[PDB]
Symmetry: D2
């Protein structure tokens, strides 16, 4: 009954089930979790692996000896459980030194520090077997217009990512970078605010093949955008390296609800797309168990992430396999959308009188698209009414 | 007193001052304008030129003889006034045949018709001297998830733009394309919904140098995004070919208010950016005089577009020239943002102990950014309190 | 299998299935429906009744003889089908005379005309058996700040509704008024923009008992508000006289999707609330079949409205009847929420040392609310996974 | 030059300039301010007074002896500076015990504790001379639909406010309550989310005359609503007891920018309304100096709040005094909006053939409203171009 196994590739950040519940108006409601306990409890729930920021695993300001001790404890728990570490990232947002950003801070010495802190954790990530290194520039942005020249900031952002790309290639590391966009919060506006802006920025880097995107459900929905559409564009570009799954109720602060909460139909179409396209990376949950919950509610919330993915996977597969749905897809001409508009070429199109001079515009206009019947079949499948 | 002249390059679409006021809940409140009158009245207001959709100038379904007559009347008014036509575009959204899109309609014969209708108007645009050809795919999208496979739709969109690029290069035309993004309306979600998505898509075309963006103030604000930030990214990529200026009050239907209305401070920072960067293209207003207005209010609204641009231009220039502002920009380290993070290179950065091992993180963290003082100087300049 | 019958009280506006598909960017895609055909087709689908604006039934500017003919044809179709007319309303938004509003137009003669047009249709509504008369002030508002003094406009709005209340009581009519809020569109901002503002306004009328609200799913969601919460407040006040059911995908133009589309989980909690509270009025669909559809898609879309209500009704009933859910509701202390905080009174509360001086604040703080487990049980029931 | 004096009645919360800069993603960037220093520094800037939560002034868990010491220190600083305390409020949101609310927590013992904590601070507020007691129910709400029965929660909310009203009247206190709405954050949805919902709720309390609203600029804008319109409705109802001034850039997390930032034109129309209506209460700033700033930037930001109010006050007064604006107001028939629609009464309106049978609907429809000219005069005045 919708039981996850490690083969489903479900992963969780240490900072997710470990969120203590401190929000901008309230103190923590839960004690801190030891990373080792989190690994053990997630393994028992059926997770495949965990992810981390450097500062989740090694407390900021630790000596090199305490650092080695923290990593050894962690690696032992991974060995004991069989859990993997597919992705790692850098905390460039919590410490007050990053209050105006890391890679695009106005202060040059902070930008250099940001790069050195990142490079140190890339080495550790590689040692733990991570294949993707995520960058979320949560402090790269501004509250006011004159504080940040955005062209200069983009030069600095490109400079930082180019240097990281030079570092991994000169070390011979087999790791790729994924940029995680977010439109706002904690800065008034954040640079590279959507999947689109991130994809466009990647094409201006020196080695674009090393960089993709790590889109998050809730972040694109904070701009009112269609998350499955944005994922489709990322797949079309060959840039979907990783994904952050959660839920969000509309345009407001980043809620990070468990996956399946928030916009349920968008979650259905997302799963349909990921499974149809054969996305093979981790199904990573970046979520926060609400601060109303005790530790029992934390693990119930984490289990619900995986359960909802598996239910939606079943419903989307039943939808696509239903002969009546396949007939409706042809009724709505989805098959024609997949055929080239003009494989005969430009000159033949120009000479084709059935394309313009003799095109019956009123007869084509009268054809219904039959989209509402198709969408109700999708609703029936989602709700288990078929 | 803030009087425009043709040298300011202010342009208007025929469909703007010509909007009859029909909205989804109401009949037209104004009679149709003859395009010739619009050209004459705009010339008297100080405009530089006009833009058009094919169907604004030539009524849909006109014979080739009526078509020639409509163009000749138009060209005579241009000659009489000295007005230019810097941009043209295609109507691929009003006729019911385009109800599921033009370039990405599920029906293949509609997609071919869409291309032939576009190519016919590219010829006319070139004949009238237009340098930019805009494409707004307002019907390319969906209300429901199963109606549109977005990867196939993007293949079709790329196919269409590649064919248009092949057409202009084989004809030897000196015209470039600009894609105008919009997140939604009239479709539930529109493909390429923001500047970012459009910029990323352009990099996958066969001849990317032929294509840029035509961002619109209100459209990016319908996604809650920072319009000056998005323009900065378009300039950074070298893709700001044209711009649509207007006003918008937040996340709601596309209001198309006169420029300066809506988000006034965003308008200030936009003008500051366009003038600082030396944008040399048309300052094009895509706006709708509210349907409360008679024809006197139409021309008052059009005049206000240009007036507000010129006032904001003066205030932004005074801001940047103020020695106290220049001092505050250095206080906030905008000069340091423009300097390379690591021109000494990767190895020197790795060997630089002042970048990490000996970096005083508490002293850097205590430095204030002085952004609020800078922003209040900007406010004082905008309001004329300095 | 989820078949509606007239006993389910499903009703539709004539303007819904009759929407021809004209939007702000496109011509109609469907021919006009005769109101008589709409009544017949809806009766065959299982609807209970229809609603109308005056101008849906009697074309604007009809003579008194044509008017009588239109009503007689309509009444014959009602007699032939058994369909009821539970609600009627006035079109105070389509004609250009209403461009600045009806009840709050700046021009006094327009406000008087608006009242006379309304009163004429109240007489007809009563003759057809309507129990609720809806007012949607879609043109009452402004695009700019100086155009409308809102205190004066509210005086005029109160004056209009007071006069309507005097009219129905002096005629001895058994009809009540329902105000339908909407935050924006077609005006930049609309007066009484949410359920809350409407409820507050009603308390200042001379006869508040005659007035309630007609909330619409999509309208509250255009302000990012929680529609079931707003309905709960309307029920708590005893003011839910009527309801408009449809779907909406977030903060954007008013989509009027079929009910169940848009925010599916909000639709579930709405149905749960309406059925639990014993709301006995019409389940009215104010929706627009998308303009992609032909007439077959129109009736498929209307049928889907009713189907989705009935599926959600079944799932909500199963949720509330599940013993495991009843146990979880007690685990989350929903039973304690329903018990008075201080039925012992103020003085006993002040003397209760267990309420403050001896209250163990750390022990109460450690109690988990168990909300995530409860919400996953609700998800399982919605998806038919239990 | 726009210098505030105590006669302008500018007030600040202790928690505003005292905000240490901890946000959901970052540690504090500023040390804590002693309340006594804040009073002294604000007095030097020209403020009139300060406001406080109980927990701002007396650290949570203080003994009665430490409590007396904290109040005495505070009162001495008030005496030394001449600063007043016009408003006080309760912190019912920071401590983990309030994680599911205070007045509407599911746990009954928490609701009783919430009432006792409030009543204790009402006594202190009265002792310090406060005239208004604000309640912001920031934790009253839910992230999921089944967690909170909203009708029961509203019963509990009414019960709490009724008990507070009984307490102040039995003590003979001359203090009134103001409810501060907010739509979301930190809860997914907050009860009484807008001015409208709060106004409607007040009419169901046992002693409605004791309760009004404390609207906040940014909170109504988090729902995309027109803040001056909402203030106008609060004034129309006689319920504007207090106001929170700040700035907000659209629909996103609560930014609490300094007043004048965010939506500048809305700030202009707000000041125009408050001054025209003769609002005589405190001009209270609930803002957060961005965490980029050091203490010099904190006081620059606080000074900017007051400066921007005074500049906008001057521009709005010049607008209303300009003879050309007065002429334009009559051109747009603002004078007619203020005249009764039907002072002649219902029967005379029914008998008035010029109101319907002989009303020239086409001639009235052709009249322009001249709103765009009026709005450009308002723009010219705001920018100092007239
Ligand atoms: O970059 C890794 C993570 O860092 C922070 O926790 C962000 O809140 C999250 O969105 C991001 O995915
Ligand atoms: O593409 C040219 C224009 O076409 C339509 O009028 C759109 O509404 C406008 O946004 C666009 O700029
Ligand atoms: O008032 C009845 C109806 O009138 C209009 O059709 C509105 O768009 C709809 O929202 C409203 O319910
Ligand atoms: O109630 C007083 C204040 O409490 C909290 O600080 C809120 O964030 C603020 O909005 C409110 O005004
Ligand atoms: Mg996130
Ligand atoms: Mg997030
Ligand atoms: Mg994330
Ligand atoms: Mg537009
Ligand atoms: Mg627009
Ligand atoms: Mg445009
Ligand atoms: Mg509606
Ligand atoms: Mg609607
Ligand atoms: Mg409606
Ligand atoms: Mg606030
Ligand atoms: Mg706030
Ligand atoms: Mg406040």
């Amino acid at each position: 009954n919708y039981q996850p196994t490690p083969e489903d590739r479900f992963t969780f950040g240490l900072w997710t089930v470990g969120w203590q519940g401190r929000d901008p108006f309230g103190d923590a409601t839960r004690r801190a979790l030891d990373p080792v306990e989190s690994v053990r409890r997630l393994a028992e729930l059926g997770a495949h692996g965990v992810t981390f920021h450097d500062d989740d695993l090694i407390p900021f300001g630790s000596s090199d000896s305490e650092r080695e001790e923290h990593v050894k404890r962690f690696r032992q728990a991974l060995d004991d459980t069989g859990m993997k570490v597919p992705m790692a990232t850098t905390n460039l947002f919590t410490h007050p030194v990053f209050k105006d950003g890391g890679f695009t801070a106005n202060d040059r010495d902070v930008r250099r520090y940001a790069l050195r802190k990142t490079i140190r954790n890339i080495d550790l990530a590689v040692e733990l077997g991570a294949e993707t290194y995520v960058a979320w520039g949560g402090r790269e942005g501004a509250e006011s217009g004159g504080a940040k020249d955005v062209r200069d900031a983009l030069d600095r952002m490109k400079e930082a990512f180019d240097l990281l790309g030079e570092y991994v290639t000169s070390q011979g590391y087999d790791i790729r970078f994924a940029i995680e966009p977010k439109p706002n919060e904690p800065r008034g506006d954040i640079l590279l605010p959507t999947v689109g802006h991130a994809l466009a920025f990647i094409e201006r880097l020196e080695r674009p093949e090393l960089y993709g995107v790590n889109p998050e459900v809730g972040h694109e929905q904070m701009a009112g955008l269609n998350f499955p559409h944005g994922i489709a564009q990322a797949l079309w570009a060959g840039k979907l390296f990783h994904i952050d799954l959660n839920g969000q109720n509309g345009i407001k602060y980043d809620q990070d609800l468990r996956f399946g909460a928030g916009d349920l139909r968008a979650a259905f179409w997302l799963v349909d797309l990921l499974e149809s396209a054969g996305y093979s990376g981790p199904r990573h949950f970046d979520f926060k168990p609400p601060r109303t919950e005790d530790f029992d509610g934390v693990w119930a919330s984490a289990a619900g992430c995986m359960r909802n993915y598996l239910i939606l996977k079943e419903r989307a597969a039943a939808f696509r396999a239903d002969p009546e749905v396949q007939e409706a897809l042809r009724a709505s001409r989805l098959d024609e959308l997949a055929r080239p508009t003009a494989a005969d070429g430009l000159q033949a199109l120009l000479d084709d009188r059935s394309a313009f001079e003799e095109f019956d515009v009123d007869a084509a206009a009268a054809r219904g698209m039959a989209f509402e019947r198709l969408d109700q079949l999708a609703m029936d499948h989602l709700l288990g009414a078929r």
